[PDB]
Design an enzyme around this catalytic site. Structure first.
Site, short mmCIF file in Angstrom:
data_model
loop_
_atom_site.label_atom_id
_atom_site.label_comp_id
_atom_site.label_asym_id
_atom_site.label_seq_id
_atom_site.Cartn_x
_atom_site.Cartn_y
_atom_site.Cartn_z
N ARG A 46 4.59 1.96 1.57
CA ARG A 46 5.31 3.16 1.16
C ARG A 46 4.56 4.39 1.62
NH1 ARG A 46 7.47 -0.91 -1.54
NH2 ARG A 46 9.52 -0.62 -2.52
N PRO B 160 0.82 -1.22 0.00
CA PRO B 160 0.00 0.00 0.00
C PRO B 160 0.85 1.26 0.00
CG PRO B 160 -0.05 -1.08 2.14
CD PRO B 160 0.58 -2.04 1.20
N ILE B 161 0.29 2.36 -0.50
CA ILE B 161 1.01 3.61 -0.61
C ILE B 161 0.19 4.70 0.06
CG2 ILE B 161 2.00 5.36 -2.15
CD1 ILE B 161 2.23 3.11 -4.25
#
Lengths: 129, 129, 128
Positions: free
Chosen positions: B39, B1-2
């Site tokens: 991230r 996931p960001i």
């Protein structure tokens, strides 16, 4: 289509122009969009503003994958295969332009419905006709 | 996931380092994702560039609601309940890390459909197999 | 310029069209940009995907602070007063278009360096 590309600090202006040209040609070819309609935004990331696994990017150099991150906004209506080609060819364009290892390049696609896309104040689904 | 987290100027490097660590672990626990794959991108906002109710954050005394805004990109397949846990725990992590009032913290989730996320030019859904 | 407007679900298609037109004109006048160059992306946010203070927008009553969030990317070179006018008039455009409380509308500006913006594969510092 619109590509927002976060890149690490320290790239030359010459790499950035090559990045903008090659990625736009790759996106044009792969999204079936005119070149002129492709917009690219480069955002540089300070190493103190980029986290991998909860660590600053500067502290995870060998293995963490710190590399370009691209979000590409495209209109709805493309197949799974065309979007796969978009991800691959845009990533290859980013990699060679920045001399960044391909495995560190991350891309995700967001689809926009035609009724959610405006150009010049008009819905794309209505000017198209 | 960001996670793309917009924060106001004036935070210390240690607060930013703690934010990256605390929010990444919260995202990891709630998204059932490997920590290394989380991230975080921190973007600083000048108060002259932040509007609340049409008024600049710099022209309204603090307490006016100017606070962190986070967009979290996660893959499809999480339940509504897991997403609510993600929103609550990441928001608390943002609040405690930046010493920002929780009531001022905004988070929204954007889901990425499988086949729309790429690493190294390859779909996450295909490198997975 | 590019406007990403995150709004809550439940708005009519005519509200969405009026939002796109009204905000694009507000951006065009205030950014001194050609109307044709104003791009708007609407993203709908499920209330289960929108958090205020760690609580879902779906679990907090209206006026709980859930409201439109807009990010506008513009080229460098506008003054603080021009950017404040952009923020005010775009926020007013969003508020009346969505019949959303003005104070629940959040807009922030991201400036792009000319050498960081590409159109048709060429730097904006060249096309201009």
């Amino acid at each position: 289509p619109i590509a927002q590309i976060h890149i690490l600090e320290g790239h030359s202006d010459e790499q950035k122009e090559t990045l903008i040209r090659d990625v736009s040609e790759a996106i044009s070819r792969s999204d079936d969009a005119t070149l002129s309609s492709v917009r690219v935004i480069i955002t540089e990331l300070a190493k103190g503003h980029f986290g991998i696994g909860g660590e600053l990017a500067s502290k995870v150099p060998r293995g963490g994958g710190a590399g370009p991150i691209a979000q590409i906004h495209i209109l709805e209506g493309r197949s799974g295969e065309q979007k796969e080609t978009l991800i691959r060819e845009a990533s290859e364009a980013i990699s060679r332009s920045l001399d960044a290892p391909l495995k560190s390049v991350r891309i995700f696609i967001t689809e926009i419905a035609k009724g959610h896309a405006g150009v010049g104040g008009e819905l794309l689904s209505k000017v198209l006709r």
